[PDB]
Amino acid sequence: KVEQSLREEMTRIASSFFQRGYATGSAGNLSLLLPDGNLLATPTGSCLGNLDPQRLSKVAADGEWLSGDKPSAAVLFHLALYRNNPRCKAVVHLHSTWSTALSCLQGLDSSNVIRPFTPYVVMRMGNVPLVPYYRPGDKRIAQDLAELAADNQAFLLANHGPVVCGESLQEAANNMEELEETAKLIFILGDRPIRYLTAGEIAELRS
Amino acid sequence: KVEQSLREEMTRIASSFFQRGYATGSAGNLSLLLPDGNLLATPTGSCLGNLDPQRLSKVAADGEWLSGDKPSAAVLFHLALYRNNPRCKAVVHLHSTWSTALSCLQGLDSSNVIRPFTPYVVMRMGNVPLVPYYRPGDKRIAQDLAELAADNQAFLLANHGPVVCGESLQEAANNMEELEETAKLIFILGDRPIRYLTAGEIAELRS
Amino acid sequence: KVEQSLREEMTRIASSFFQRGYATGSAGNLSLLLPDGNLLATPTGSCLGNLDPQRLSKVAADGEWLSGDKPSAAVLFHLALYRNNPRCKAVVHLHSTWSTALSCLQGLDSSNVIRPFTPYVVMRMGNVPLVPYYRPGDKRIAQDLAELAADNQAFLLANHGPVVCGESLQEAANNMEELEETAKLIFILGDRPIRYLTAGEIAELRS
Amino acid sequence: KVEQSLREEMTRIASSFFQRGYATGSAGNLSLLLPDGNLLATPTGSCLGNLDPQRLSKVAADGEWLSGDKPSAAVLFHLALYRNNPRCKAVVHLHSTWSTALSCLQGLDSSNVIRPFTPYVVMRMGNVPLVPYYRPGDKRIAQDLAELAADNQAFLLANHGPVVCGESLQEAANNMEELEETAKLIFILGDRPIRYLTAGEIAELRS
């Protein structure tokens, strides 16, 4: 069954994030779009490193909890991204160290939080806009993500972490990994004179 | 048997801490409360990455070593936390890098060692008070933890590391992971202008 | 079959890089030389942590895709290294954090990007020249690597990462690991007074 | 057979060091003392993450290679430690990142390279003297380690890394892990005002 292999892929990818330090405790959740249009999401209060595939949540496009354990409360803004971007087929939301660290900085650019010095995040994602800080579970987190969903596939929630989309769970996972990697390079480079990509070198990647 | 699954869960969670770098050598110990009220703790001189479930220590509420290998000497303050907080059902004590690093700083706040810039540690734990430095195994470590046990679920022992409680071993592990994560962000952010959560944003999380 | 064990070794080594944080997402590719002279390379759009051995790409010396999935676009400069260094039997290309970080610095030395303070990179690789930044997939990346292939076994592509060769896949992997380790020490040491190896201590290692 | 379980323990411990980032490539070697007095050491050109237990080297006290693959060239100073400390039963030598980083600093103390701010390295090892930098394989590395072997169980080789002993392989591994952890805290704390252990707090640990 295709749904069974999708549940195992989510379990497998979730465990990978947990063992490699991307996921911290019960902080985070993943979701993908099944062929029929329904959602497959990690349940609430679930450690990403030991997920039960047959207990993964199943939510309809309108938000109706269909089967599996209770979905995570963060699924509310997962649905906002699917409803405003037809090319979004999977959402990866983690509180990875360096992306969450970047999101806690004053004077960030809410249109694109990283200035590119490597070509990969511009090629895969482009602009990473900043979502304002709200209490976890706030209505305005999902409402803001719905405004930016049509023309962005990655987002940085302030004092929270990144939220990355993709046309497949593997793609959204890889995109999340390159975003967290780029934020990690920002802090590593620090005050050193970085050779940023010039405006012309950026335009060659937007194609 | 429920006790068998609790022993395996402790072995499993311990190995996770070891493979992901939270536990260093034989430095650390875990304990949980069994349904009958007795304790299940990791034994002394035991590497958390290769625990034998059927050799885990079993200690009564009064401190009597019942079965299994010799319990860790740190179990003495584990019992202090259970005797002064009825909601404490598991204790996780590790010398994780960034929490232990934070505990070695001068001018720390002994009422709450971290100023929140992310909402999660305030939501799950609240205040992380500082326990003074003593020789490992000192009577005063357990005596101090008994004073703060009633109204705190996490503690930072100076020049030592963190000690986190929970209503379940999974909860105490997740809480430990978010505390160590927050101390890791402190050193990563460094002297950068951090956007701390304002007093009003903190009060919305204490509910 | 020898080819089967070479496919498994590539799968095994690739997974090791992925689980230990050297490989990030789909960023990277490995290749080795089979006894008959043909290439065995990781395919495009493939996560290094879950490679299928029987789907690894097979490319002839002239660049003809023979079997397996579509090879990575980076294979183009893999072939440039084999065609200009008969002792190169395997190529490891990853975007590891600290090597990629070093490659983003202004004022680097394009003849040797690291000044030795440990003896190991000088013993195994020697000089690590800098390849200019181009758009990923540019013809000039392979053309430049062909110029430096005869007398170098490691290369640092600016705003990109390292590219390391070896007389075996294990050797090229070990060389990559010591290069990334040395770049990691550079940023860790920072502005501290480092005791660099003197010119005489370097000459004793070039033998 | 006891020797078989010792070979598996060495293989198991070696893999743990490799997967957790302590060992980098083929850089490093482990050895322990068998009951009969002979040595069990990791062979040369061997990746610590995939050791064959039945191919581990076997060396007599006088240095005669008895069985298994060719022992590592670093075994020469392993034997120097056993011949000058009867309580040394295992030697762990790795080029771990932060210990190797510390060993590259000018103005180190050759009597004890770390000033204690945590009690654990003083309790387990005590003084960590500095061994001068020589070409890898130099006679003077083993000769210097033989001078300090009688009254020290850990050593820091300049521009090289740590070398830790123990009364068992598990003990030497745990000691190595706490030494590398302490060097990691040194760089993390940096220029921050550290609350070092006072002279009186150190004397309570030397007992």
The size of the A-B interface in CB pairs under 8 A is 70
Partner residue facing D97 (CB), from C19, C185, C194 = C185
- Catalytic choice (B22, B82, B120, B134): B120
Closest CA to B92 of B154, B30, B175: B30
Give 3-state DSSP helix, strand, coil % of chain D, rounded to 5: 40, 20, 45
Give the separation between CA A17 and CA A32, rounded to whole angstroms. Answer: 16
Question: CA-to-CA distance for C168 and C190, rounded, in angstroms?
Answer: 33
Distance CA B121, CA C177 (A): 36
Closest CA to B160 of B76, B102, B92: B102
**CA–CA distance, C144 with C148 (Å, rounded to integer):** 7
Count of residues for chain A?
A: 207
Q: Which amino acid, residue D95?
A: H
Query: Residue B127 and residue B205: Cα distance in Å, rounded?
Result: 12
> How far is B48 from chain A, CA to nearest CA, in Å?
16
DSSP E strands, A34-152: 39-41, 57-59, 65-67, 90-94, 130-131
Pair C39, C80: CB distance under 8 Å: no
Distance CA A165, CA A186 (A): 22
**Cβ–Cβ < 8 Å for D43, D49:** no
Closest-CA residue of chain C to A203: C135
| Residues in chain D whose C lies over 2.5 Å from the next residue's N (breaks after) | none
Verify whether the Cβ–Cβ distance D123 to B104 is below 8 Å: no
B98 and B180 in contact (C-beta within 8 Å)? Answer: yes
Identify the CA nearest to A179 among candidates A101, A115, A121, A94: A121
Residues from chain C that touch A16, judged by Cβ atoms under 8 A, are 49
Residue C177 structure tokens: 């690991």
Contact (CB<8Å) C106/A175: no
How do C65-67 and C90-94 pair as beta strands?
unpaired
Residues of B with Cβ-Cβ distance to D185 under 8 angstroms: 97, 100-101, 104
Residues 6+ apart with CB under 8 A from D44: D29, D69, D70, D71, D72, D73
Of B12, B21, B181, the CB nearest to A24: B181
- Report which of A76, A95, A66, A62 is spatially closest to residue A31, judged by C-alpha positions: A76
The yes-or-no answer on residue C133 being catalytic is no
D50 contacts C192? CB cut-off 8 A: no
Which neighbouring-strand residues pair with D164?
D92, D154
Determine the residue of chain C that is closest to A22 in CA distance.
Answer: C21
Which residue among C21, C184, C193 sits closest to D107, beta carbon to beta carbon? C193
Q: How far apart are CA A99 and CA A27, in angstroms?
A: 14
List CB contacts of D183: < 8 A, sequence separation 6 or more.
Answer: D98, D99, D101, D102, D114
Nearest to C25 among A21, A119, A177 (CB): A177
- Cα distance between residue B20 and residue C207, in whole Å: 40
Rounded-to-integer distance, Cα A175 and Cα A157, Å = 16
Inspect the interface and report whether the beta carbons of C189 and D135 lie closer than 8 Å: no
CA distance D127 to D125: 6
Which of B26, B160, B188 to probe by mutation at the D interface, max D CB count within 10 Å?
B26
- CA atoms of D70 and D128, how far apart (whole Å): 30
D120/D123 Cα distance (integer angstroms): 5
**B159: nearest Cα among B137, B133, B129, B186:** B133
At what resolution in Å was this solved? 2.7
Of B49, B54, B157, B51, which is closest to residue B103 (Cα–Cα)?
Answer: B157
Q: Which residue of A has its CA nearest to C20?
A: A20
Which stretch of DSSP H or E encloses residue A123?
helix A120-124
Residues contacting C129, CB < 8 A, separation 6+:
C110, C111, C112, C113, C148, C152, C155, C156
Which residues of chain D have a Cβ shorter than 8 Å from any chain B Cβ?
Answer: 12, 16, 19-21, 117-120, 123, 170, 173-175, 177-178, 181, 184-185, 188-189, 192-195, 197, 201, 204-205
Inter-residue long-range contacts of D40-44, CB under 8 Å, 24+ positions, other chains counted: D40/D3, D40/D6, D40/D7, D40/D10, D41/D71, D41/D72, D41/D75, D41/D78, D42/D10, D42/D14, D42/D71, D42/D72, D43/D68, D43/D69, D43/D70, D43/D71, D43/D72, D44/D69, D44/D70, D44/D71, D44/D72, D44/D73
Q: Identify the domain containing residue D3 by its residue range.
A: 1-207
Q: How far is CA A175 from CA A183, C197, D130, in A?
A: 13, 40, 45
How many angstroms separate the Cα of D125 from the Cα of each of A49, A79, B23, B95, C48?
35, 56, 19, 17, 40
Among candidates D25, D27, D106 on the partner chain, residue whose Cβ is nearest the Cβ of C195: D106
Residues of chain D found within 8 Å of residue C16, distances taken between Cβ atoms:
49
Minimum CA–CA partner of C187 in chain D: D101
Nearest CA among D145, D187, D137 for reference residue D162: D145
> A105 and B193 in contact by Cβ < 8 A?
yes
The answer to whether C101 contacts A177, with C-beta atoms less than 8 Å apart, is: no
- Cα B9 to Cα B162: distance, rounded to the nearest angstrom: 21
| Residue tagged 């010119």 (tokens) | C199
Name the domain count of chain C.
1
Q: What are phi and psi of C119, to 5 degrees?
A: -80, -10
Judge: C118–D100 Cβ closer than 8 Å, yes or no: yes
Contact B197 A159 (CB under 8 A): yes
Beta-carbon contacts of residue A76 (< 8 Å; ≥ 6 apart)? A63, A137, A141, A142
Helices and strands (DSSP H and E) totals, chain B: 7, 8
Q: Based on DSSP, count helices (H) and strands (E) in chain C, helices before strands.
A: 7, 8
| Residue C148: burial class (beta carbons within 10 Å; 0-12, 13-18, 19+) | buried
Q: Which residue of B has its CA nearest to A105?
A: B194
Q: Could you tell me which chain B residue has the CA closest to the CA of D18?
A: B19
Q: Per the CB < 8 Å rule, is C104 touching A117? A: yes
Cβ atoms of C169 and C9 within 8 Å: the answer is: yes
Helix, strand, or coil (residue C33): strand
Sign of the Cα torsion D2, D7, D8, D9 reads positive
Yes or no, beta carbons of D117 and B19 under 8 Å apart: no
Solved using: X-ray
Q: Are C122 and D109 in contact (CB under 8 A)?
A: no
- How would you label B19-29 residue by residue, b for 16+ Cβ within 10 Å and e otherwise? bbebbbbbbbb
Gap between the Cα atoms of A173 and A97, Å rounded? 16
